Amino acid sequence: QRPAPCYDPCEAVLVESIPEGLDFPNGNPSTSQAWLGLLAGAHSSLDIASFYWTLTNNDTHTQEPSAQQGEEVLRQLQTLAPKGVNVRIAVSKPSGPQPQADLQALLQSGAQVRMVDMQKLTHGVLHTKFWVVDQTHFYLGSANMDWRSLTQVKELGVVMYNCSCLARDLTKIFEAYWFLGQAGSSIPSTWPRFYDTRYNQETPMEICLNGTPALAYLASAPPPLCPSGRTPDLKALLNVVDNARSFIYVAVMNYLPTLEFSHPHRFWPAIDDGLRRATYERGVKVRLLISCWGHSEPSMRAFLLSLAALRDNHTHSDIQVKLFVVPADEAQARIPYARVNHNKYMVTERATYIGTSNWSGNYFTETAGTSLLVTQNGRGGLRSQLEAIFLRDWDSPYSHDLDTSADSVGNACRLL
Ligand SMILES: *[C@@H]1O[C@H](CO)[C@@H](O[C@@H]2O[C@H](CO)[C@@H](O)[C@H](O)[C@H]2NC(C)=O)[C@H](O)[C@H]1NC(C)=O
Ligand SMILES: *[C@@H]1O[C@H](CO)[C@@H](O[C@@H]2O[C@H](CO)[C@@H](O)[C@H](O)[C@H]2NC(C)=O)[C@H](O)[C@H]1NC(C)=O
């Protein structure tokens, strides 16, 4: 019936990037600190699933002092293969030709690197970001292999420490990326047993998490990349939504009930109707915190206003939407593709979901993504820490109702 429990002493830590100048009145380790500490303690293996690499000023054609943390991350990674650590890096194939200075330097250092052509395989991209260290620890979250991800962009991830069972489960997902990064690869009709898992929505892994029992599993996207035991990302996410009885707090960079960039536009109401059902059938309080910046897709506005219109005193329907805007001063505004909140996570009164994907259809049907799902009885824990980060952001001055003036938010914002 139920698969074997895990005996490892797992400890989870939420790790954040807080961009320079973003202040919150009255603390977690930073992505940069957590990463440097994962590298310093690596003795055998490092697997990185990645979207792109821009860790240096040279990569972005800037001269920013705040790129130093990214350049120190690259320097540490270059010491790993020479000292005997097996480094494997899966990266998304860019759509055109692009310079690959970081990956060259790591190849030169002895790391193995495979480009994955998800466009050929699924019409999507390899979007996931995660690290697996020594088959024991992993990072899963929103931060890219990008110096801007350490200092100029707001990020949210988790580091699971001392949790070899779950790290090995994550390595299985990595191994599918690693296989597909080979010449002549196609998606097998059936994935071999080597990739399958017992740990999923129906039977999550029983773990001991910061000293108390928890239920954890890893979900994966797109469906072609899921062996039969592997819960698909979208199914995991909708299960948290459908099980919520008091609130759903969602902080995601983009939300769009469409299959974004489809030449014939394609409506995609899967998550939308989940949130509508939750609030109308079960009286769930839904708070959606969507990021906004100069690159936001302007069609988001009408769909977000559609959701917000459901608030009704007498139906106990209570959806609220805010936009989170990272301010950019003059010098910051010259950094390409920065000053935005990249977080992607969901928390309810009983469950956590930490993902790598934005909430539009292609991320769940074509593009590679992963998410960690944890449930755990008892006040406190990982779940209350994530709720606290959400409420911090929701109540901060960086969060704005949809009627807010564009000239109040401290940055370009296409949704206002
Ligand atoms: C993960 O496991 C390591 C190794 O067991 C823990 O590190 C040790 O913690 C003990 C007791 O807390 C210390 O006395 C040692 O100095 C640590 N290093 C060793 C034993 O090599 C670590 O605390 C656990 N948690 C995390 C987040 O790393
Ligand atoms: C689970 O254990 C981890 C590891 O001890 C906790 O993370 C530490 O939290 C303190 C503050 O409480 C930080 O100053 C440390 O830097 C963190 N350690 C590491 C290795 O990052 C985490 O808070 C614990 N979570 C719960 C819910 O108890």
Numbering used by the authors: 72 to 97, 101 to 490
Question: How did the manuscript describe this experimental structure?
Answer:
Human 5′‐3′ exonuclease PLD3, a member of the phospholipase D family of enzymes, has been validated as a therapeutic target for treating Alzheimer's disease. We could not measure any phospholipase activity but the enzyme shows robust nuclease activity.
Here, we have determined the crystal structure of the luminal domain of the enzyme at 2.3 Å resolution, revealing a bilobal structure with a catalytic site located between the lobes. We then compared the structure with published crystal structures of other human PLD family members which revealed that a number of catalytic and lipid recognition residues, previously shown to be key for phospholipase activity, are not conserved or, are absent. This led us to test whether the enzyme is actually a phospholipase. Finally, we have mapped key single nucleotide polymorphisms onto the structure which reveals plausible reasons as to why they have an impact on Alzheimer's disease.
